DNA sequence: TACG
């Protein structure tokens, strides 16, 4: 109600007057109706459409069911857009390939469907007047499906769900997609044009929007694998291994670079993840070969040229033209050229050594944004200046806060809680858990602790564990909304029904080469390496936990902080108390909400 | 100064 008015009133007019604009707004607040209801009046008005991006399915679904609703109330032309990765049927039919990319699919699609239309409607069974039928539109258009149940419903009535979406979003003025199919500059463009629109016209709605910087960051950032190489070097010996030069082979070359990744991780990595050089890889290439700079570099031209060749035999003989070679070479020539300020260079043992440009500063890859008209909705988004230096969006904010009964909801830290130090935090745990009696999620910072913890203890518990799993992940919260007691996890990730939860500690970010990387970015950058690399993210993981606990006028939740250092915080969570045994005072929060 |  009241909140949502002036919420729509500030969207609106700052929307006139700025290229975007931030709100904040806790849980259960309807940020996503506040967006959706603020750029349909907007765009409207100016004659542009919406684009409402999503991070994940579980983003898709909520936004997807508000849209299905608002179809009563007015008339809703929208559709899920994903890119042929995730909705072409065909190619993870007649191929197996560990990586993938637009283009490539591009190519194998288009020749796809030539053969369709020579008279070989077997090469693509999915590609048929379906594609453009009443019934597949009104299902797209009338159902609003996610592009999950899209791509379920083509298969099922044998017609491709990606053609489908790409014929009916002329006729779309809302779409909703993943944040990395949009901001896939390649695929963007094509997306736009099949759209039939500029980027001037159209109002986009980042949803999740505190996650801007980390998605940012990660389609920015690219790596080079050991397993990535050998299946290069099987490329290679599928595709003739031919001379590049001198008497080096493709496989030489990978042979050359491969080792030199090894020898790296070798003798640099010690503890774990490291930063390096950009530099150093070409280093122990020219050191190792007794071979220029140039050199090298002309014969990771000479593989890109290589893996062209691949792509071209491929393409011609009806499989997917991708090229490990060419992808490879890539990679390893962007590696080489990359700002050595916006972006470090970092070398890991991990899943068998890899070296990565990490990029930094995500503002260089969000900036096509400013493009568009922008919407960033998150409940956990202030201080807005941080998010404003990190994004590089310089746009009106405004706050709403505290939407439901603030007796309603406790939230406190204890500063009691090392082999002696875990003993304590298990024994702190316990009384809390044992004494209150409740449905609880106990977040810790790592597997370790949590594992460290569990025992002591116990009570029956659940852990969203290792390598989970997706699938299980759901049965695992099914079971959790009713044989229901204890869950543990790390806030790292994917997480009436939830009463409290537990943060046994702050889950301050991993001292790691990446971390301290960006530490020192935004140290020399503004003086604030430490509210800007560890602070901020930290109240964005806590507040997001926190968050879940309340999504309504009469729920009820606890949440106890178990860490001394909670009260540097408190400039993020502004009304949490301090306790000094959380066990009752929970334990009697719980009683007074329960007089109503 | 202060991150697992
Ligand atoms: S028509 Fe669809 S399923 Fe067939 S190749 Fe193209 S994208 Fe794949
Ligand atoms: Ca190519």
Same mark, same amino acid.
């Given at each position: 109600?009241?909140?949502?008015?002036?919420?729509?009133?500030?969207?609106?007019?700052?929307?006139?007057?700025?290229?975007?604009?931030?709100?904040?707004?806790?849980?259960?607040?309807?940020?996503?109706?506040?967006?959706?209801?603020?750029?349909?009046?907007?765009?409207?008005?100016?004659?542009?459409?919406?684009?409402?991006?999503?991070?994940?399915?579980?983003?898709?679904?909520?936004?997807?069911?508000?849209?299905?609703?608002?179809?009563?109330?007015?008339?809703?032309?929208?559709?899920?857009?994903?890119?042929?990765?995730?909705?072409?049927?065909?190619?993870?039919?007649?191929?197996?390939?560990?990586?993938?990319?637009?283009?490539?699919?591009?190519?194998?699609?288009?020749?796809?469907?030539?053969?369709?239309?020579?008279?070989?409607?077997?090469?693509?069974?999915?590609?048929?007047?379906?594609?453009?039928?009443?019934?597949?539109?009104?299902?797209?258009?009338?159902?609003?499906?996610?592009?999950?149940?899209?791509?379920?419903?083509?298969?099922?009535?044998?017609?491709?769900?990606?053609?489908?979406?790409?014929?009916?979003?002329?006729?779309?003025?809302?779409?909703?997609?993943?944040?990395?199919?949009?901001?896939?500059?390649?695929?963007?463009?094509?997306?736009?044009?099949?759209?039939?629109?500029?980027?001037?016209?159209?109002?986009?709605?980042?949803?999740?929007?505190?996650?801007?910087?980390?998605?940012?960051?990660?389609?920015?950032?690219?790596?080079?694998?050991?397993?990535?190489?050998?299946?290069?070097?099987?490329?290679?010996?599928?595709?003739?291994?031919?001379?590049?030069?001198?008497?080096?082979?493709?496989?030489?070359?990978?042979?050359?670079?491969?080792?030199?990744?090894?020898?790296?991780?070798?003798?640099?990595?010690?503890?774990?993840?490291?930063?390096?050089?950009?530099?150093?890889?070409?280093?122990?290439?020219?050191?190792?070969?007794?071979?220029?700079?140039?050199?090298?570099?002309?014969?990771?031209?000479?593989?890109?040229?290589?893996?062209?060749?691949?792509?071209?035999?491929?393409?011609?003989?009806?499989?997917?033209?991708?090229?490990?070679?060419?992808?490879?070479?890539?990679?390893?020539?962007?590696?080489?050229?990359?700002?050595?300020?916006?972006?470090?260079?970092?070398?890991?043992?991990?899943?068998?050594?890899?070296?990565?440009?990490?990029?930094?500063?995500?503002?260089?890859?969000?900036?096509?944004?400013?493009?568009?008209?922008?919407?960033?909705?998150?409940?956990?988004?202030?201080?807005?200046?941080?998010?404003?230096?990190?994004?590089?969006?310089?746009?009106?904010?405004?706050?709403?806060?505290?939407?439901?009964?603030?007796?309603?909801?406790?939230?406190?830290?204890? %500063?009691?809680?090392?082999?002696?130090? *875990? +003993?304590?935090? &298990?024994?702190?745990?316990?009384?809390? =858990?044992?004494?209150? /009696? !409740?449905?609880?999620?106990?977040?810790?910072?790592?597997?370790?602790?949590?594992?460290?913890?569990?025992?002591?203890?116990?009570?029956?518990?659940?852990?969203?564990?290792?390598?989970?799993?997706?699938?299980?992940?759901?049965?695992?919260?099914?079971?959790?909304?009713?044989?229901?007691?204890?869950?543990?996890?790390?806030?790292?990730?994917?997480?009436?029904?939830?009463?409290?939860?537990?943060?046994?500690?702050?889950?301050?970010?991993?001292?790691?080469?990446?971390?301290?990387?960006?530490?020192?970015?935004?140290?020399?950058?503004?003086?604030?390496?430490?509210?800007?690399?560890?602070?901020?993210?930290?109240?964005?993981?806590?507040?997001?936990?926190?968050?879940?606990?309340?999504?309504?006028?009469? %729920?009820?939740?606890?949440?106890?902080? *178990? +860490?001394?250092? &909670?009260?540097?915080?408190?400039?993020? =969570?502004?009304?949490? /108390? !301090?306790?000094?045994?959380?066990?009752?005072?929970?334990?009697?929060?719980?009683?007074?909400?329960?007089?109503?």
């Amino acid at each position: 109600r009241q909140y949502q008015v002036e919420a729509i009133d500030f969207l609106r007019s700052s929307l006139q007057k700025s290229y975007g604009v931030a709100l904040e707004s806790p849980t259960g607040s309807g940020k996503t109706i506040m967006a959706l209801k603020s750029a349909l009046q907007y765009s409207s008005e100016r004659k542009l459409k919406v684009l409402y991006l999503v991070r994940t399915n579980s983003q898709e679904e909520q936004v997807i069911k508000e849209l299905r609703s608002l179809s009563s109330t007015m008339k809703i032309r929208a559709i899920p857009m994903q890119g042929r990765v995730n909705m072409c049927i065909l190619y993870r039919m007649v191929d197996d390939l560990h990586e993938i990319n637009a283009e490539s699919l591009a190519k194998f699609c288009n020749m796809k469907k030539r053969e369709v239309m020579a008279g070989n409607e077997a090469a693509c069974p999915y590609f048929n007047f379906k594609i453009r039928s009443d019934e597949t539109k009104r299902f797209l258009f009338d159902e609003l499906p996610t592009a999950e149940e899209f791509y379920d419903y083509g298969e099922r009535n044998n017609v491709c769900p990606y053609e489908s979406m790409k014929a009916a979003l002329p006729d779309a003025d809302i779409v909703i997609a993943p944040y990395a199919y949009f901001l896939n500059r390649s695929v963007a463009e094509k997306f736009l044009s099949h759209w039939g629109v500029s980027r001037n016209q159209i109002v986009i709605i980042l949803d999740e929007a505190h996650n801007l910087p980390d998605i940012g960051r990660s389609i920015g950032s690219f790596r080079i694998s050991v397993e990535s190489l050998n299946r290069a070097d099987r490329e290679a010996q599928a595709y003739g291994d031919p001379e590049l030069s001198q008497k080096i082979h493709v496989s030489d070359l990978i042979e050359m670079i491969r080792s030199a990744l090894q020898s790296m991780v070798s003798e640099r990595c010690g503890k774990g993840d490291v930063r390096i050089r950009f530099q150093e890889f070409m280093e122990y290439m020219r050191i190792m070969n007794k071979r220029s700079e140039r050199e090298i570099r002309s014969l990771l031209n000479y593989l890109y040229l290589f893996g062209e060749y691949v792509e071209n035999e491929k393409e011609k003989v009806g499989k997917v033209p991708f090229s490990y070679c060419s992808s490879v070479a890539s990679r390893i020539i962007a590696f080489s050229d990359q700002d050595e300020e916006k972006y470090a260079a970092i070398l890991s043992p991990e899943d068998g050594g890899y070296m990565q440009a990490a990029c930094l500063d995500p503002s260089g890859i969000l900036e096509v944004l400013k493009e568009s008209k922008t919407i960033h909705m998150s409940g956990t988004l202030d201080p807005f200046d941080f998010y404003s230096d990190i994004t590089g969006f310089e746009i009106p904010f405004k706050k709403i806060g505290e939407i439901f009964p603030p007796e309603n909801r406790y939230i406190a830290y204890y %500063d009691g809680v090392d082999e002696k130090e *875990l +003993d304590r935090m &298990a024994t702190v745990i316990e009384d809390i =858990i044992l004494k209150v /009696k !409740k449905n609880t999620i106990v977040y810790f910072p790592s597997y370790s602790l949590m594992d460290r913890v569990e025992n002591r203890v116990s009570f029956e518990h659940m852990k969203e564990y290792r390598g989970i799993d997706q699938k299980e992940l759901y049965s695992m919260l099914k079971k959790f909304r009713r044989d229901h007691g204890t869950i543990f996890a790390v806030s790292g990730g994917r997480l009436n029904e939830l009463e409290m939860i537990i943060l046994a500690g702050l889950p301050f970010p991993r001292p790691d080469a990446i971390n301290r990387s960006l530490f020192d970015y935004y140290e020399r950058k503004y003086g604030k390496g430490w509210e800007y690399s560890v602070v901020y993210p930290t109240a964005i993981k806590i507040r997001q936990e926190i968050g879940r606990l309340i999504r309504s006028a009469e %729920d009820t939740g606890a949440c106890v902080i *178990l +860490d001394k250092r &909670a009260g540097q915080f408190r400039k993020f =969570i502004p009304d949490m /108390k !301090k306790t000094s045994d959380p066990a009752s005072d929970i334990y009697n929060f719980f009683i007074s909400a329960q007089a109503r």
